[PDB]
Amino acid sequence: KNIKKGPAPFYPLEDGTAGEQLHKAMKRYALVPGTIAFTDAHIEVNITYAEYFEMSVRLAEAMKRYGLNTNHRIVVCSENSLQFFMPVLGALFIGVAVAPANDIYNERELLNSMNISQPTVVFVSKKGLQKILNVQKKLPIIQKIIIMDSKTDYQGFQSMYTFVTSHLPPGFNEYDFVPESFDRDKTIALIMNSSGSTGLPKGVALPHRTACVRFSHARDPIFGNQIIPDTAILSVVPFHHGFGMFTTLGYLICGFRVVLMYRFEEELFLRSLQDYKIQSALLVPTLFSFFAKSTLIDKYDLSNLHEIASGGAPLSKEVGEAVAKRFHLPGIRQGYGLTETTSAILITPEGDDKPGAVGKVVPFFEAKVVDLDTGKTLGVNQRGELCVRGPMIMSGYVNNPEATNALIDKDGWLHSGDIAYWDEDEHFFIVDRLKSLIKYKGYQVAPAELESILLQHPNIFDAGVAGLPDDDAGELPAAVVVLEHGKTMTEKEIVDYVASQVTTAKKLRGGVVFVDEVPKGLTGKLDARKIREILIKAK
Ligand SMILES: Nc1ncnc2c1ncn2[C@@H]1O[C@H](COS(=O)(=O)NC(=O)c2csc(/C=C/c3nc4ccc(O)cc4s3)n2)[C@@H](O)[C@H]1O
């Protein structure tokens, strides 16, 4: 009754594995000559579905022969590049699971993912190699390091191109390759690294069944992208995380041109949007503060830009709208999701933008809000913990059944750990993450509200709210702030402005600290530890 179910899908769940469904598709677009799969903007290099389909099939077989099967895994440890999805596609076609890694990941972070992933073959960039060499000193499961962005054998490590030849038969056809068939409910497709709530990130295991459902959404005209061939998406989302991962595997399934960047550059992004004639952009919530400013957004012709999509972190109503105006759009096609749900299970329906809302329930899903204490399902406009269930939910946490039984309850409902509510026309609204909440004098103070309000001020460029520990008060809400070039506001001006918009309960009693950039988690997300350290060193 109060259970908000998603609709029927335009494109029903197609039979076979993620690997089989991906293959079938990239053969479609490869036999069509000239079709582009990935484009590099920094170096203006294209690469066709023929070149990609082939080099992915070559790696699939090359590995198949090397001796990997459904009882093996790998690592892909690279930043956004043309090379990244070749070994991803390779692995999915034979039933080897993939564990993406963060090129920026530090030594401990990296090791923890490796120890969980237990990778047989590790794919890495020339930048990333030396961290692998360091961590492989305690990782004896690893037999092979393969350099991704190279063509000749580098420092005794093979290239993907050399690895391929030294296993592929001389007389072999890429258009004759057949992908392995298996139990997609049982066979693990991906192993995602989480934010670990507060600790060493877990092993989020995602079956082939999940990706099969993800494709059904990406082909859906309302809940994704209408399959217009030779559409060009500009992705500036880290591929290792669910957002960049599952949006791209969807785009390959539709035959779109994925334009990508290794790092953000405001100067280029718009010229990329203009020159390549981009239809959909793929920013992360934190890049929005650079565009609500003004600058060059209508000094480049963004006439083609049909929309801007966002997720993987919160976005304030007033900043999301401020950007849609500047890009000359009806809104921001937001989405919400957990890595434990593969991809976004709440997506903004096409032509159904709702400012601060993330979106309605995607097909094959059921979303509901529960009474934080009693656990009963609440009705319209009622705030509480958001619970979701459908076929994109994880199978479990790698060697961690305890945390799995604490997140996913007995009827299969995943517990988000987020305060949400659903409005009259079923748009879902995330309030705040339950652990982000600042504890004042027995009060629950949401950082998303104080952020949303601070961000409305014209002199404020960007800001992040956190809980300065006190003693008497236990925790005072305080904010790290950024201004535009040539702007000033005294702390007391900012405080008194917050105070004039909120009750005494959630005043900014911890104060303000002025920074050049807000601690960003580089997955869109705002970093709490680094803010908490900034605020704590300032008092
Ligand atoms: N839209 C949020 N609004 C508040 N918060 C959030 C939100 N999205 C993610 N958190 C925060 O992230 C927490 C979990 O972190 S997480 O494991 O890294 N999950 C993700 O962030 C995540 C993984 S995949 C994924 C999918 C992203 C998208 N995929 C698409 C595809 C199409 C499209 O139009 C939009 C999107 S958005 N998100 C959530 O519990 C919540 O606090």
Residue numbers in the entry: 5 to 543
Task: Tell me what the authors wrote about this structure, in their words.
Bioluminescence light emission is produced through the catalysis of a small molecule substrate, most commonly D-luciferin (D-LH2), by a luciferase enzyme. We recently described the LH2 analogue infraluciferin (iLH2) which has a luciferase dependent red-shifted peak emission of up to 706 nm. In this work, we explored the possible structural interactions in the enzyme that may account for the near infrared emission of iLH2 and its application to dual-BLI in vivo.
First, the X-ray crystal structure of FLuc in complex with a high-energy intermediate analogue, 5’-O-[(N-dehydroinfraluciferyl)-sulfamoyl] adenosine (iDLSA) was determined to provide insight into the FLuc-iLH2 light-emitting reaction. The structures show good alignment to each other, however there is evidence of a more open active site supported by a reduction in root-mean-squared (RMSD) score when aligned based on just the N-terminal domain of FLuc rather than the entire structure (RMSD = 0.688 and 0.783 respectively). The altered position of the benzothiazole ring and the greater size of iDLSA may be the cause of a series of small active site changes that affect residues Glu311, Arg337, Asn338, Gly339, and Thr343 resulting in a total of six differences in H-bonding interactions. Evidence for the disruption of the network is the absence of a H-bond between Arg337 and Glu311 that is found in the DLSA structures of FLuc and L. cruciata Luc.
